[PDB]
A = this chain, B = another copy of it.
Amino acid sequence: LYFQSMLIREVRVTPVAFRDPPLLNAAGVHQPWALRTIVEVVTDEGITGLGETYGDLAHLEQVRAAAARLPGLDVYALHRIYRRVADVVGANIVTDMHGLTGSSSRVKTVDRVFAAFEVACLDIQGKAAGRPVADLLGGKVRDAVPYSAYLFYKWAGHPGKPEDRFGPALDPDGIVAQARLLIGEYGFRSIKLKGGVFPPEQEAEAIQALRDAFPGLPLRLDPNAAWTVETSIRVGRALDGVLEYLEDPTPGIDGMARVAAEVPMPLATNMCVVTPEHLPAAVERRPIGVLLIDHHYWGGLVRSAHIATLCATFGIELSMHSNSHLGISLAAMTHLAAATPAITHACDTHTPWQDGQDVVAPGALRFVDGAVPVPDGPGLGVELDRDALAVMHEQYERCGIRTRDDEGYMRSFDPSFSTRRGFW
């Protein structure tokens, strides 16, 4: 009767930490431990669903608060769950320390907390129907989702820890060699370089060297708003016919709009259009040709799919943004991209940098020629490896990091460093 209608019995929230390399970006350097939060929704009948979100302490505390107010709600009642999260978040606005996904706000905070639950509830709905999540989203329109090689400048390793197998990358030769390593292992057919680390002329030379080494592979460059309008325009024109797109060259909708009218390739963003309140300004001002969507902060798979439709109506193309993440997020990203016609560019992923660390059972997620086939099983098609989850949770307990702070980590070496924002 009552306990046989797919109601939530309990929600388990487990923060986890896993090893991350010293990847460089406009906000500093990645710390040695990356944090995530794993969410497991369990129904009365024992069906479980998994979600994954940010590990930062302020977010984790909201996720815990919301989780404690979900028992008794129906896993199909996504509007009602969204409302409950919004009630729990209340007046609070959660801000991160890096700004690499743009400004904070109330709606964005609610969407970030809601997304973990929503993915888990969709996993459950898929299982209950014997179908992949993609089928709840209208069915897959492609069998496999292409991902890009996500290249970074990086240190050889962190201070007083072992050097990683990737080696250092601090110039065009190192960037090219890093690309050969990733493409060789994963088969990526697109390349993205994370910029805003070295002067723009040096990063432009890395892009040129990639083009020479990898003819025919689409290239993207992302300085995370590290440049001025003037520099952006200069670099934009110097890279004519070389980039598929230029992502967030400069801060703010106004600056982006001025760059866009003067460079030959489209602009992309995951910094100045990051919540639905920003869309009408994006339509009006045209700062971008491509929106990088990310279900972790747009509020889950369904809301992301609605945003895709809106973008397509107003003539904006879609790709997918990525932060260091595990297999649950990769499965979710893959279902969403597989079922969304408007997501036509290769998606980003950090997967290769995690070096095989994961909390799901092996064999469900694989890369085939640079693409991830939609997983086989009903729901997300991944299952929790509980021993690995316990190891990563213990890592979190001992790791001494509670909030992602790339700038703080860089400042521990160079106290005059600040996140580069319209700096070059």
Is A4 at the interface (CB under 8 A from chain B)?
Answer: yes
Q: Which residue of B lies closest to A93 (CB)?
A: B341
Could you tell me if B377 and A3 are in contact, using CB atoms closer than 8 angstroms? yes
| Given A80-B139, A141-B79, A378-B3: A279 and B129 interface contact (C-beta under 8 Å) | no
Which of these binds chain B: A17-25, A70-78, A177-185, A405-413? A70-78
Q: Which residue of B lies closest to A78 (CB)?
A: B138
Could you tell me if A76 and B139 are in contact, using CB atoms closer than 8 angstroms? yes
| Given A279-B313, A283-B280: A2 and B130 interface contact (C-beta under 8 Å) | yes
Q: Which residue of B lies closest to A279 (CB)?
A: B313
Q: State the Cβ distance, A195 to closest chain B Cβ, in Å.
A: 31
Cα-based distance from A378 to B4 in the complex (angstroms): 8
Is A170 at the interface (CB under 8 A from chain B)?
Answer: no
* A341: chain B residues within 8 A (beta carbon): 79
A52-73 CB mask vs B (1 if < 8 Å, else 0) is: 0000000000000000000000
Is A91 at the interface (CB under 8 A from chain B)?
Answer: no
Could you tell me if B78 and A139 are in contact, using CB atoms closer than 8 angstroms? yes
A residues 128-151 touching B (CB-CB < 8 Å): 128-132, 135-136, 138-141
Q: State the Cβ distance, A136 to closest chain B Cβ, in Å.
A: 8
Is A309 at the interface (CB under 8 A from chain B)?
Answer: yes
A residues 282-334 touching B (CB-CB < 8 Å): 283, 302-303, 305-307, 309-310, 313-315
Is A376 at the interface (CB under 8 A from chain B)?
Answer: yes
Could you tell me if A276 and B313 are in contact, using CB atoms closer than 8 angstroms? yes
Is A339 at the interface (CB under 8 A from chain B)?
Answer: yes
* A83: chain B residues within 8 A (beta carbon): 141
A residues 315-362 touching B (CB-CB < 8 Å): 315, 339, 341
Cα-based distance from A139 to B81 in the complex (angstroms): 10
- How many residues on chain A are close to B (CB under 8 Å)? 44
Is A127 at the interface (CB under 8 A from chain B)?
Answer: yes
Which of A4, A80, A139: most chain B Cβ within 10 A? A139
* A306: chain B residues within 8 A (beta carbon): 305-306, 309-310
| Given A309-B306, A313-B276, A313-B280: A76 and B131 interface contact (C-beta under 8 Å) | yes
Select one of B138, B307, B377 contacting A79, CB under 8 A. Answer: B138
| Given A279-B313, A314-B280: A3 and B139 interface contact (C-beta under 8 Å) | no
Q: State the Cβ distance, A10 to closest chain B Cβ, in Å.
A: 20
Could you tell me if A135 and B77 are in contact, using CB atoms closer than 8 angstroms? yes
| Given A3-B378, A130-B2, A130-B4: A138 and B313 interface contact (C-beta under 8 Å) | no
Q: State the Cβ distance, A283 to closest chain B Cβ, in Å.
A: 7
* A376: chain B residues within 8 A (beta carbon): 3
* A128: chain B residues within 8 A (beta carbon): 1, 129
Could you tell me if B138 and A302 are in contact, using CB atoms closer than 8 angstroms? yes
Select one of B138, B139, B339, B378 contacting A1, CB under 8 A. Answer: B378
Beyond A74-B135, A129-B129, A279-B313: 8 further Cβ-contacts under 8 Å?
A1-B128, A2-B130, A4-B130, A76-B135, A76-B138, A78-B139, A128-B129, A283-B283
Between A and B, 9 residue pairs with Cβ closer than 8 Å are A3-B131, A76-B131, A79-B140, A80-B141, A279-B314, A307-B309, A309-B309, A309-B310, A310-B310
